[PDB]
Symmetry: D2
Subunit: 298 residues, 4 copies
């Protein structure tokens, strides 16, 4: 099974004038590798793919791949609505040296099931990389159902996992039973911090979740405790992860919150976010701070 | 805090000719008390309140109260759409000797916020009993939001808890922070088996969930282990509770599944259900059986 | 085709104690007959069926059928969640002299397709009367799709129409194409005032809508103009029906608004509504009066 | 009021390689001008904006604007998720000679109300052109409510209308009452063929709808009839518009259907569509032909 464990959706650090901040992104990447994560995911939702142009995304991905320098597996988010661009971005990722791509379903038009299957098959045909699907129905308005995902895994042998971003134990459970039941090494990762523990206990593989940016140790240490058989210890970290997502209510999008938390937790980076996100106000920054203090994370 | 712990939503046992089955309902109640539950809830969703007439509900509640004979706390479900009938049923429950009532929001019309608050205030004024609210937005089409619930707790001192039936860690989390933050002894119970463990870890109080009918020991032992500080043991029961809700997919309504599970787990009762539910077919009964066998519950 | 044309969901008039007001209700019935309606529907949503007990409903149906005295066809709404009661109510209706029954899908549990089909078949097999289906997905949480309705019409020759209460031209169009396509005499009536014109232009049959109570002349005149071939005239009445639903925004439920509108348009009936509805307050009563004035309805 | 009457979301014609087909597109533009439309809208949903890259969109807009050569007003759709691109595309549009821009709400993240208001204000402040808002909640997952649209019109004097793409008479009615009430010259256009008549009757201004492409005469004639006072005639055309959207059920996305319909109604343009849309298959082409024949459009 590929891309298991803790794989943060890495924030892209931008300068005050909206440019890729290479020193700050590079520092964050190094912090996360030092924290013992099992891979890194660039240009996910949290990485602001949807507010970046295609050439911008290529530049980011190349930089991030090159900086990681094969120390851990790298995933690149190459999706969007423009299917031709998805193929371009995904071929570019393979050419630049990525280890896999993560592809959401198109999220403007909710295309027919035939078109959707076709789309994923075409993307998967465009590269020899492993492809991780990305379900986020609260944003896409179209669920990648367990049956559909199994149909995709059946169709293309490089469709090898999913980031299932949904506050649903049933959806995770059923994704695992249905897809992993047919394909024991297909990877199921949850997209929310507070579902990591359950995802493991259900027979899934890990998480790609925002707290990997500012508190990776909590997930890293949970996974380690789980793999060590120290279930009580894992449960202790879970209690923390249960509380973290309160923070994400502070704004929408909450990309600003995540970057502010990176700062509060000891890594000073520019917190600039791309429109239509906006900077987090001071009152909510302090609120973030008290939540992190309460959980003993800064 | 009232009505904490494990409180099953007791199935009502009916004869083949659709009458209350007093011997079978009584045996079930006795099994559950023997298993160490903290209370019993009759005429919940699982108890088929919505398929029974008001006089039928009164007869059932009186029998059940009298059979329990004060051995554990008794809750009666008295809700519906007819508000005058809610008050009648609720006063009848107090007069018959119930320890509390559970009231869902009206679920045909989703009334205005003003009318909703008013409705709950009138119901709560009609009785001196403790009132537990019942959120089930998948069926009602109208969420009892944490803010609303706190407004209710603020308004009437006998509105003292909630059964929150939703596959959502966020909703449980926010119910707890918001309402228990203002009212530390307000009771939060989840309505799904697979949310008990998280509910406790979040600072909530228990569950009213269907598996309490056929496998109460799992929840009872989880709660006991949590209270003993044996987290790893609690997590072990949780792993079981994570899988149980697969069963409930076997039909809709799944009241038939629950009663079939009661039988398979060692209590032989008529499994008759009221229309528009229907008897579980033999193939699906066997499927239920293999699920219970796999979880080592029969 | 049975039950075509303008069929008001007649308001139930109650005294302050919540009991049936026979002179008030009778007067309203006589007003509507006199206005040229094609039929009368008692105990629909607007008639407060979901806030009445079974015995209360039977009394109301009996009285209304008896007052109408066969001057126009009479429909009784017999639905609920309690399917045994649905059968008792429907048989009671047939016995009491109704011309047909109107049955909504159970709206607590959204039952499986198999259970839903069976329910409707069982209700239709319980009477020799014609049965109109009732779709109100905003309230039920479960749409009666044109395919499902076709399946029901294919299955039982006494399932002979539908009240399609949805603000959707697509739904009405598809209902008419899919069901009337297969059953040319199946009746399709919209449930909203502002969809009558379109319903008729689409090949549908009329409306059961709330403004039937206080301004039946608009709908009766629209239909007469249409049947007479004066489409410009019909469109003129439609322009008024397009504006009327403004008023229903004044409260939820809006059965209070409908009765105050009956008063304001010249029929002094008691405006009492059953909980959890409540009295329309004086500012909103004044807004309603102003609206009715602007539309030339009082 | 700006941009009133019939303004087609013009189809973008491509060669098989997915590049702009200039003779095809030009011919379609000329057909539509020749049919009496009041304006032309390029790179709406029907124009495939969401499957095109930014440089491609600029090329297309430049070409279209230039071909129209000021014969009718020209709207360019400039939205997306990337707000910096939105500004660049809108400024490009103004520079290129467009009369106005059409901006949808960001449809990945459904941004907070503060962020959304800010977005639209920032986009409106980036140009001196008039700005039409674009509401398509079925696809965006986030409704531009009449209250929000009013707030936008109150905030910026160049936010001057909306394309309200929703199958809802209530939404259109309220949009018109809430916004045009405060801003009598604010333009309200429906986005669906079957709501044009009702839109005009409600006090609104016209339609941006797909049948503008292959049957512009129906809408143009309807509007002429209405403006002439011949409401019966207008209703006649409406009766065709009511039936047209049947065809859009043939595929999702249905941009393929629209181009095949342009071919079948006498204009042989290439029907290529960008992925993830795909070619309409021959059986469905034959159903489409049959439908257009039945409606007397070819
Ligand atoms: C994954 C995490 C999740 O979708 C929260 O936003 C990501 O790509 O950010
Ligand atoms: C409560 C349990 C929960 O609703 C499971 O379905 C009940 O009243 O049945
Ligand atoms: Mg993220
Ligand atoms: Mg239950
Ligand atoms: Mg009504
Ligand atoms: Mg279009």
């Amino acid at each position: 099974a590929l891309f298991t464990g803790i794989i943060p959706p890495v924030s892209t650090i931008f300068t005050a004038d909206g440019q890729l901040d290479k020193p700050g992104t590079a520092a964050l990447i190094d912090d996360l590798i030092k924290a013992g994560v099992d891979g890194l995911f660039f240009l996910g939702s949290g990485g602001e793919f949807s507010q970046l142009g295609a050439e911008e995304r290529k530049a980011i991905a190349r930089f991030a791949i090159d900086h990681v320098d094969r120390r851990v597996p790298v995933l690149i988010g190459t999706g969007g609505t423009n299917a031709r661009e998805t193929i371009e971005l995904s071929q570019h990722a393979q050419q630049a040296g990525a280890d896999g791509i993560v592809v959401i379903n198109p999220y403007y038009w909710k295309v027919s099931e035939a078109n959707l299957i076709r789309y994923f098959e075409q993307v998967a045909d465009s590269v020899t990389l492993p492809v991780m699907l990305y379900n986020f129905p609260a944003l896409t308005g179209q669920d990648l159902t367990p049956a559909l995902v199994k149909t995709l895994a059946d169709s293309r042998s490089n469709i090898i996992g999913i980031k299932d971003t949904i506050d649903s134990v049933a959806h995770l459970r059923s994704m695992i039973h249905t897809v992993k039941g047919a394909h024991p090494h297909f990877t199921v990762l949850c997209g929310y911090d507070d579902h990591l523990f359950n995802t493991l206990l259900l027979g899934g593989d890990g998480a790609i979740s925002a707290s990997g940016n500012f508190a990776p140790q909590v997930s890293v240490n949970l996974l380690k405790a789980w793999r060590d058989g120290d279930v009580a210890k894992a449960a202790g970290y879970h209690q923390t992860l249960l509380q973290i997502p309160q923070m994400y209510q502070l704004d929408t999008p909450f990309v600003n919150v995540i970057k502010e938390a990176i700062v509060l937790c000891g890594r000073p980076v520019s917190t600039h976010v791309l429109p239509p996100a906006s900077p987090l106000d001071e009152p909510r920054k302090a609120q973030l701070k008290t939540l992190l203090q309460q959980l003993k994370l800064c």
